[PDB]
Design a protein around this nucleic acid. Sequence first.
DNA 1: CGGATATCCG
DNA 2: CGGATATCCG
Lengths: 120, 126
Amino acid sequence: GTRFERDLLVELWKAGFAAIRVAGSGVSPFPCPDIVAGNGRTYLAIEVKMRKELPLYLSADEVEQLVTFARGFGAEAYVALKLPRKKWRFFPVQMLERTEKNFKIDESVYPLGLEIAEVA
Amino acid sequence: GTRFERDLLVELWKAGFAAIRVAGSGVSPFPCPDIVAGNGRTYLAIEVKMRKELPLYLSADEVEQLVTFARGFGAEAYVALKLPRKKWRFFPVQMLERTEKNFKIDESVYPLGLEIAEVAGKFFQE
DNA sequence: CGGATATCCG
DNA sequence: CGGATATCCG
């Protein structure tokens, strides 16, 4: 829980990123994203999710907010997803699938996600 | 809160930055700034300070950690200082005055600080 | 958020 | 070295 978020930051740090947890932006009612990270070359805006199983559903609003932040900041928008017994896995927002009104990572997308080492 | 960070976040947003306050910005063993901001081309790591009057003293450790973070992340390190009845002013770490063991912003340096519009203007540098 | 000590400026 | 401030830690 708190455990796996610590694990995610420690993995990012070991991969060479300085990474911070976000408290807020002072202008929006919601804190976005969850983590921002940079290594001097690559910058990441990360929405962090844990799920007991697939699929992960994301609202259109939450994907829009993440993409808008990433564009305004100069970062790559990512979703980090933790499943039980699995390592953290990273999905560029471009990998998300659409539902009628929203977004998802289902069984067909999950295998395409990246290990932190590849993101670097 | 603080209400100071909040007010600075609003000014950064008005100046075209996507800015965020850093959480657990004291309880961590690793270096981390108060605010991190980007506008698509410029990246800032900012230590935020409010004082009734000059000088602002800054510890060697606080400045070293700010520089270390900014180097690892890929950002420019700045101190943001608010004095009563003055707008926020931004100081690149290279601009800080030195005391015997630490750092400060005092009467000689305060006038050289940048207004938020000049920081935002870095967008157009190559 | 605030009380008390360690640091340290001048 | 005296007193202002950074910092710790409940």
